[PDB]
């Protein structure tokens, strides 16, 4: 699968349909 390819907490590389909200992403480059 490709969902193990990003899982939205390692690379994701998105925004809305990524790993949830930026602040709510516990990531985003540290906002």
From Swiss-Prot:
Mutation: residue 28 to R; reported impact is: In PNDM4; uncertain significance
Q: Which residues form the propeptide?
A: 1-31
Q: Where in the cell?
A: Secreted
Assembly and partners are described as: Heterodimer of a B chain and an A chain linked by two disulfide bonds.
Q: Which family does it belong to?
A: Belongs to the insulin family.
Biological role: Insulin decreases blood glucose concentration. It increases cell permeability to monosaccharides, amino acids and fatty acids. It accelerates glycolysis, the pentose phosphate cycle, and glycogen synthesis in liver.
The disease this record links to the protein is: Hyperproinsulinemia: An autosomal dominant condition characterized by elevated levels of serum proinsulin-like material. Type 1 diabetes mellitus 2: A multifactorial disorder of glucose homeostasis that is characterized by susceptibility to ketoacidosis in the absence of insulin therapy. Clinical features are polydipsia, polyphagia and polyuria which result from hyperglycemia-induced osmotic diuresis and secondary thirst. These derangements result in long-term complications that affect the eyes, kidneys, nerves, and blood vessels.
Protein name stated in the entry: Insulin
**Which source organism?**
Homo sapiens
What gene makes this protein?
INS
